[PDB]
């Protein structure tokens, strides 16, 4: 039958207002709430996301996991003219829906969808995509890759002192190894934010982890 993703885009195109990103977010959330797709209702995690973008005003953001473009629209609507969101999405069908979503919101010029797995694309950012360091990273992809991809970003020289990581779903279904690493490491200053999931009626959360630069090369 019809995929979730084709129906989400349909609903936006039929109900939201072109070039009004807020209306796009609200349409996605309305539809996904009515369908009882708990993990696809973004308004609770979005309050935390908006505050992070407003405080730090990043010029270059990397998103891991686009899906249908909700979080890309959410962040990009608050970015400055000339600022950039790179979003990595390994499923080309989802990349396609995200592209259509951005076009409808009028935010396509601020976002570049990179089609592939984060583990493959991250090592290409410096040379292929001319990235220096990221100002912010939003982690919202495969749970078991949050810690590995953080370590990969570190190794590839893509984080600087001040880079803000914001990780979603760190409680449900959970990213406990990622949390233990950043909270335990002197290279990250961390803050936790609670975020509710309907239907399951559970308090999930997001973690903000601000990179402080690498640990000493010596003991
Ligand atoms: N290793 C990976 N690299 C890139 N994309 C991935 C990877 N593992 C999963 N994904 C994608 O991560 C997405 C996970 C979603 N939860 C993203 C939701 C989206 N950020 C939103 O707020 O609506 C899916 O679209 C997956 O196809
Ligand atoms: K900035
Ligand atoms: K996730
Ligand atoms: K820490």
mmCIF file of C-alpha atoms and ligand atoms in Angstrom:
data_model
loop_
_atom_site.group_PDB
_atom_site.id
_atom_site.type_symbol
_atom_site.label_atom_id
_atom_site.label_comp_id
_atom_site.label_asym_id
_atom_site.label_seq_id
_atom_site.Cartn_x
_atom_site.Cartn_y
_atom_site.Cartn_z
ATOM 1 C CA UNK A 1 0.000 0.000 0.000
ATOM 2 C CA UNK A 2 0.859 3.714 0.046
ATOM 3 C CA UNK A 3 4.001 4.521 1.993
ATOM 4 C CA UNK A 4 3.988 6.789 5.001
ATOM 5 C CA UNK A 5 6.323 9.130 3.173
ATOM 6 C CA UNK A 6 4.227 9.636 0.054
ATOM 7 C CA UNK A 7 1.209 10.347 2.271
ATOM 8 C CA UNK A 8 3.083 12.890 4.404
ATOM 9 C CA UNK A 9 4.123 14.839 1.297
ATOM 10 C CA UNK A 10 0.581 14.569 -0.099
ATOM 11 C CA UNK A 11 -0.847 16.013 3.098
ATOM 12 C CA UNK A 12 1.561 18.945 3.070
ATOM 13 C CA UNK A 13 0.913 19.722 -0.584
ATOM 14 C CA UNK A 14 -2.846 19.654 0.031
ATOM 15 C CA UNK A 15 -2.939 21.535 3.341
ATOM 16 C CA UNK A 16 0.139 23.681 3.949
ATOM 17 C CA UNK A 17 0.971 27.058 2.409
ATOM 18 C CA UNK A 18 3.788 27.274 -0.167
ATOM 19 C CA UNK A 19 6.797 29.158 1.113
ATOM 20 C CA UNK A 20 5.499 29.098 4.694
ATOM 21 C CA UNK A 21 7.806 26.720 6.559
ATOM 22 C CA UNK A 22 5.849 26.984 9.815
ATOM 23 C CA UNK A 23 2.716 25.797 7.989
ATOM 24 C CA UNK A 24 4.672 22.863 6.575
ATOM 25 C CA UNK A 25 5.838 21.771 10.044
ATOM 26 C CA UNK A 26 2.354 22.121 11.456
ATOM 27 C CA UNK A 27 0.821 20.106 8.612
ATOM 28 C CA UNK A 28 3.302 17.257 9.051
ATOM 29 C CA UNK A 29 2.706 17.194 12.799
ATOM 30 C CA UNK A 30 -1.090 17.327 12.397
ATOM 31 C CA UNK A 31 -1.138 14.427 9.956
ATOM 32 C CA UNK A 32 1.334 12.273 11.887
ATOM 33 C CA UNK A 33 -0.560 12.879 15.156
ATOM 34 C CA UNK A 34 -3.811 11.779 13.537
ATOM 35 C CA UNK A 35 -2.075 8.624 12.227
ATOM 36 C CA UNK A 36 -0.579 8.028 15.699
ATOM 37 C CA UNK A 37 2.935 7.823 14.291
ATOM 38 C CA UNK A 38 4.620 8.788 17.550
ATOM 39 C CA UNK A 39 8.163 9.086 16.236
ATOM 40 C CA UNK A 40 7.054 11.379 13.413
ATOM 41 C CA UNK A 41 5.514 14.109 15.565
ATOM 42 C CA UNK A 42 8.248 16.704 15.879
ATOM 43 C CA UNK A 43 6.722 19.568 17.791
ATOM 44 C CA UNK A 44 8.130 18.574 21.226
ATOM 45 C CA UNK A 45 11.709 17.978 19.995
ATOM 46 C CA UNK A 46 11.310 21.062 17.752
ATOM 47 C CA UNK A 47 11.065 23.460 20.715
ATOM 48 C CA UNK A 48 14.514 22.309 21.825
ATOM 49 C CA UNK A 49 15.883 22.427 18.271
ATOM 50 C CA UNK A 50 14.644 25.969 17.693
ATOM 51 C CA UNK A 51 16.267 27.181 20.922
ATOM 52 C CA UNK A 52 19.600 25.669 19.907
ATOM 53 C CA UNK A 53 19.517 27.327 16.479
ATOM 54 C CA UNK A 54 18.479 30.677 18.019
ATOM 55 C CA UNK A 55 21.225 30.618 20.632
ATOM 56 C CA UNK A 56 24.157 29.537 18.468
ATOM 57 C CA UNK A 57 23.184 30.886 15.034
ATOM 58 C CA UNK A 58 25.224 28.266 13.119
ATOM 59 C CA UNK A 59 26.373 29.097 9.577
ATOM 60 C CA UNK A 60 26.919 25.456 8.603
ATOM 61 C CA UNK A 61 24.810 22.647 9.998
ATOM 62 C CA UNK A 62 25.101 18.924 9.274
ATOM 63 C CA UNK A 63 22.018 16.740 9.731
ATOM 64 C CA UNK A 64 22.283 12.963 9.906
ATOM 65 C CA UNK A 65 18.954 11.503 8.772
ATOM 66 C CA UNK A 66 16.481 13.571 6.752
ATOM 67 C CA UNK A 67 13.490 11.236 6.294
ATOM 68 C CA UNK A 68 10.797 13.515 4.763
ATOM 69 C CA UNK A 69 12.481 16.804 5.583
ATOM 70 C CA UNK A 70 10.719 17.871 8.770
ATOM 71 C CA UNK A 71 13.844 18.619 10.775
ATOM 72 C CA UNK A 72 15.586 20.137 7.734
ATOM 73 C CA UNK A 73 12.654 22.548 7.260
ATOM 74 C CA UNK A 74 12.615 23.211 11.001
ATOM 75 C CA UNK A 75 16.269 24.194 11.158
ATOM 76 C CA UNK A 76 16.618 25.811 7.738
ATOM 77 C CA UNK A 77 13.712 28.193 8.381
ATOM 78 C CA UNK A 78 15.798 29.741 11.164
ATOM 79 C CA UNK A 79 19.140 29.912 9.323
ATOM 80 C CA UNK A 80 20.556 33.190 7.984
ATOM 81 C CA UNK A 81 20.671 34.071 4.296
ATOM 82 C CA UNK A 82 23.787 32.410 2.931
ATOM 83 C CA UNK A 83 23.920 29.809 5.723
ATOM 84 C CA UNK A 84 23.852 26.134 4.805
ATOM 85 C CA UNK A 85 22.341 22.872 6.014
ATOM 86 C CA UNK A 86 23.867 19.662 4.668
ATOM 87 C CA UNK A 87 21.589 16.696 5.288
ATOM 88 C CA UNK A 88 22.701 13.104 4.831
ATOM 89 C CA UNK A 89 20.052 10.601 3.867
ATOM 90 C CA UNK A 90 20.901 7.136 2.707
ATOM 91 C CA UNK A 91 17.480 6.182 1.316
ATOM 92 C CA UNK A 92 17.070 7.820 -2.107
ATOM 93 C CA UNK A 93 13.277 7.590 -1.925
ATOM 94 C CA UNK A 94 13.356 9.564 1.313
ATOM 95 C CA UNK A 95 15.860 12.017 -0.198
ATOM 96 C CA UNK A 96 13.370 12.529 -3.041
ATOM 97 C CA UNK A 97 10.499 13.324 -0.661
ATOM 98 C CA UNK A 98 12.762 15.629 1.371
ATOM 99 C CA UNK A 99 13.699 17.508 -1.798
ATOM 100 C CA UNK A 100 10.039 17.989 -2.704
ATOM 101 C CA UNK A 101 9.312 19.095 0.871
ATOM 102 C CA UNK A 102 12.055 21.720 0.795
ATOM 103 C CA UNK A 103 10.873 23.010 -2.576
ATOM 104 C CA UNK A 104 7.351 23.430 -1.214
ATOM 105 C CA UNK A 105 8.693 25.307 1.815
ATOM 106 C CA UNK A 106 10.858 27.525 -0.433
ATOM 107 C CA UNK A 107 14.012 26.528 1.492
ATOM 108 C CA UNK A 108 15.724 24.389 -1.154
ATOM 109 C CA UNK A 109 18.565 26.857 -1.705
ATOM 110 C CA UNK A 110 19.613 26.681 1.982
ATOM 111 C CA UNK A 111 19.780 22.872 2.076
ATOM 112 C CA UNK A 112 21.905 20.348 0.243
ATOM 113 C CA UNK A 113 20.722 16.745 0.434
ATOM 114 C CA UNK A 114 23.660 14.339 0.341
ATOM 115 C CA UNK A 115 22.504 10.902 -0.760
ATOM 116 C CA UNK A 116 24.377 8.143 0.948
ATOM 117 C CA UNK A 117 25.316 6.675 4.280
ATOM 118 C CA UNK A 118 26.825 9.031 6.830
ATOM 119 C CA UNK A 119 29.802 6.702 7.294
ATOM 120 C CA UNK A 120 30.613 7.081 3.580
ATOM 121 C CA UNK A 121 29.859 10.776 3.167
ATOM 122 C CA UNK A 122 31.456 12.167 6.319
ATOM 123 C CA UNK A 123 35.022 11.425 5.062
ATOM 124 C CA UNK A 124 34.187 13.296 1.842
ATOM 125 C CA UNK A 125 33.062 16.535 3.460
ATOM 126 C CA UNK A 126 36.502 18.187 3.591
ATOM 127 C CA UNK A 127 37.683 17.597 0.059
ATOM 128 C CA UNK A 128 34.535 16.958 -1.996
ATOM 129 C CA UNK A 129 32.234 19.431 -0.226
ATOM 130 C CA UNK A 130 34.888 21.974 0.824
ATOM 131 C CA UNK A 131 33.914 21.904 4.497
ATOM 132 C CA UNK A 132 36.242 23.383 7.121
ATOM 133 C CA UNK A 133 34.432 22.557 10.358
ATOM 134 C CA UNK A 134 30.775 22.242 11.212
ATOM 135 C CA UNK A 135 29.066 24.757 13.483
ATOM 136 C CA UNK A 136 26.340 22.288 14.481
ATOM 137 C CA UNK A 137 25.476 18.622 13.934
ATOM 138 C CA UNK A 138 21.970 17.204 14.364
ATOM 139 C CA UNK A 139 22.139 13.428 14.912
ATOM 140 C CA UNK A 140 18.879 11.678 14.103
ATOM 141 C CA UNK A 141 19.823 8.608 12.051
ATOM 142 C CA UNK A 142 20.578 4.974 12.981
ATOM 143 C CA UNK A 143 21.013 4.792 16.768
ATOM 144 C CA UNK A 144 24.077 2.544 16.629
ATOM 145 C CA UNK A 145 25.879 5.101 14.469
ATOM 146 C CA UNK A 146 25.623 8.102 16.799
ATOM 147 C CA UNK A 147 28.844 7.287 18.671
ATOM 148 C CA UNK A 148 30.788 5.893 15.673
ATOM 149 C CA UNK A 149 29.902 8.917 13.496
ATOM 150 C CA UNK A 150 30.822 11.346 16.299
ATOM 151 C CA UNK A 151 34.220 9.672 16.519
ATOM 152 C CA UNK A 152 34.492 9.781 12.709
ATOM 153 C CA UNK A 153 33.622 13.471 12.595
ATOM 154 C CA UNK A 154 36.326 14.048 15.238
ATOM 155 C CA UNK A 155 38.946 12.065 13.364
ATOM 156 C CA UNK A 156 38.198 13.742 10.049
ATOM 157 C CA UNK A 157 38.827 17.159 11.608
ATOM 158 C CA UNK A 158 35.230 18.314 11.109
ATOM 159 C CA UNK A 159 34.593 19.507 14.676
ATOM 160 C CA UNK A 160 36.038 22.654 16.256
ATOM 161 C CA UNK A 161 35.904 24.035 19.752
ATOM 162 C CA UNK A 162 32.342 25.329 19.939
ATOM 163 C CA UNK A 163 30.714 22.902 17.508
ATOM 164 C CA UNK A 164 27.292 22.020 18.907
ATOM 165 C CA UNK A 165 26.092 18.417 18.621
ATOM 166 C CA UNK A 166 22.394 17.884 19.196
ATOM 167 C CA UNK A 167 21.291 14.238 19.319
ATOM 168 C CA UNK A 168 17.655 13.088 19.141
ATOM 169 C CA UNK A 169 16.085 9.940 20.617
ATOM 170 C CA UNK A 170 18.846 9.459 23.147
ATOM 171 C CA UNK A 171 16.403 7.767 25.571
ATOM 172 C CA UNK A 172 13.822 6.090 23.286
ATOM 173 C CA UNK A 173 14.885 3.765 21.770
ATOM 174 C CA UNK A 174 18.123 5.147 23.228
ATOM 175 C CA UNK A 175 21.742 5.887 22.477
ATOM 176 C CA UNK A 176 23.317 4.942 25.815
ATOM 177 C CA UNK A 177 26.862 4.432 24.526
ATOM 178 C CA UNK A 178 26.842 7.869 22.845
ATOM 179 C CA UNK A 179 25.586 9.451 26.093
ATOM 180 C CA UNK A 180 28.205 7.697 28.211
ATOM 181 C CA UNK A 181 30.946 8.896 25.856
ATOM 182 C CA UNK A 182 30.066 12.563 25.594
ATOM 183 C CA UNK A 183 29.083 12.925 29.252
ATOM 184 C CA UNK A 184 32.314 11.191 30.341
ATOM 185 C CA UNK A 185 34.643 13.002 27.941
ATOM 186 C CA UNK A 186 36.410 16.263 28.741
ATOM 187 C CA UNK A 187 35.999 17.122 25.043
ATOM 188 C CA UNK A 188 32.229 17.654 25.418
ATOM 189 C CA UNK A 189 30.083 19.826 27.646
ATOM 190 C CA UNK A 190 26.638 18.288 27.799
ATOM 191 C CA UNK A 191 23.078 19.290 28.572
ATOM 192 C CA UNK A 192 20.023 17.032 28.523
ATOM 193 C CA UNK A 193 16.513 18.063 27.409
ATOM 194 C CA UNK A 194 13.365 16.015 27.984
ATOM 195 C CA UNK A 195 11.015 15.506 25.053
ATOM 196 C CA UNK A 196 7.696 13.697 25.180
ATOM 197 C CA UNK A 197 6.466 10.993 22.841
ATOM 198 C CA UNK A 198 2.726 10.562 22.517
ATOM 199 C CA UNK A 199 0.916 7.190 22.583
ATOM 200 C CA UNK A 200 3.860 5.520 24.262
ATOM 201 C CA UNK A 201 3.483 8.383 26.776
ATOM 202 C CA UNK A 202 7.204 8.351 27.469
ATOM 203 C CA UNK A 203 9.801 10.999 28.146
ATOM 204 C CA UNK A 204 12.462 10.715 25.449
ATOM 205 C CA UNK A 205 15.202 13.309 25.261
ATOM 206 C CA UNK A 206 17.835 15.134 23.308
ATOM 207 C CA UNK A 207 21.430 15.705 24.268
ATOM 208 C CA UNK A 208 23.359 18.852 23.474
ATOM 209 C CA UNK A 209 27.103 18.131 23.502
ATOM 210 C CA UNK A 210 29.374 21.066 22.738
ATOM 211 C CA UNK A 211 32.818 20.045 21.534
ATOM 212 C CA UNK A 212 35.704 21.629 23.424
ATOM 213 C CA UNK A 213 38.547 20.606 21.139
ATOM 214 C CA UNK A 214 40.493 17.376 21.276
ATOM 215 C CA UNK A 215 41.944 15.878 24.377
ATOM 216 C CA UNK A 216 45.691 16.254 24.888
ATOM 217 C CA UNK A 217 47.689 14.118 22.433
ATOM 218 C CA UNK A 218 49.558 12.855 25.497
ATOM 219 C CA UNK A 219 48.313 11.024 28.590
HETATM 220 N N1 LIG B 1 23.836 5.646 8.347
HETATM 221 C C1 LIG B 1 22.884 6.519 7.818
HETATM 222 N N2 LIG B 1 23.280 7.516 7.004
HETATM 223 C C2 LIG B 1 22.354 8.334 6.486
HETATM 224 N N3 LIG B 1 21.003 8.262 6.696
HETATM 225 C C3 LIG B 1 20.596 7.286 7.552
HETATM 226 C C4 LIG B 1 21.562 6.378 8.101
HETATM 227 N N4 LIG B 1 20.801 5.407 8.979
HETATM 228 C C5 LIG B 1 19.502 5.876 8.799
HETATM 229 N N5 LIG B 1 19.427 6.897 7.993
HETATM 230 C C6 LIG B 1 18.246 7.610 7.743
HETATM 231 O O1 LIG B 1 17.973 8.308 9.023
HETATM 232 C C7 LIG B 1 16.551 8.730 8.997
HETATM 233 C C8 LIG B 1 16.053 8.630 10.423
HETATM 234 C C9 LIG B 1 14.839 9.516 10.759
HETATM 235 N N6 LIG B 1 14.503 9.294 12.095
HETATM 236 C C10 LIG B 1 15.107 11.006 10.555
HETATM 237 C C11 LIG B 1 13.888 11.890 11.007
HETATM 238 C C12 LIG B 1 14.090 13.341 10.627
HETATM 239 N N7 LIG B 1 15.313 13.873 11.147
HETATM 240 C C13 LIG B 1 12.913 14.097 11.183
HETATM 241 O O2 LIG B 1 13.020 14.776 12.237
HETATM 242 O O3 LIG B 1 11.795 13.975 10.595
HETATM 243 C C14 LIG B 1 15.901 7.842 7.999
HETATM 244 O O4 LIG B 1 15.330 8.676 6.925
HETATM 245 C C15 LIG B 1 16.953 6.902 7.548
HETATM 246 O O5 LIG B 1 16.843 6.476 6.157
HETATM 247 K K1 LIG B 2 27.139 32.022 12.752
HETATM 248 K K1 LIG B 3 17.189 8.596 15.394
HETATM 249 K K1 LIG B 4 31.660 15.691 29.448
#
